[PDB]
């Protein structure tokens, strides 16, 4: 770990990945299949 390491910023990656919008739709589709 150092000042110039990769230093991932998870919230920024989340917004850059469209808030995982396709995963959100997939999760929703699976959830309503319960039982």
């Amino acid at each position: 770990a150092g000042p110039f390491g990769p230093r991932p910023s998870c919230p920024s990656e989340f917004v850059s990945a469209h808030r995982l919008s396709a995963c959100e739709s997939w999760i929703h589709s699976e959830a309503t299949n319960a039982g």
Binding site: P6, P8, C10, E13, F14, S16, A17, H18, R19, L20, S21, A22, C23, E24, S25, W26, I27, H28, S29, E30, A31, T32, N33, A34, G35
Partner: protein, 74 residues
């Protein structure tokens, strides 16, 4: 078909935009967002929602991650 559903493949592409050590935290955030936006309250649906999210790295070839650990559901 042996290929996965297109929507699942789109999800995997989005997950690949993140570092492995961010995936589980962001999937928890995604699950909470869907749960709240869609007003999912039936117990079995809520459990399946969060379980599906925790298994996505293993549904998506993220070998370093595996299945995300269980965290109590809000």
């Amino acid at each position: 078909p042996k290929e996965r559903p297109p929507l699942l493949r789109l999800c995997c592409t989005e997950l690949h935009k993140e570092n492995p050590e961010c995936v589980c935290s962001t999937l928890r955030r995604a699950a909470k967002a869907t749960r709240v936006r869609q007003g999912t309250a039936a117990a079995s649906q809520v459990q399946r929602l969060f379980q599906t999210a925790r298994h996505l790295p293993s549904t998506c070839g993220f070998a370093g991650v595996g299945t995300c650990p269980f965290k109590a559901t809000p």
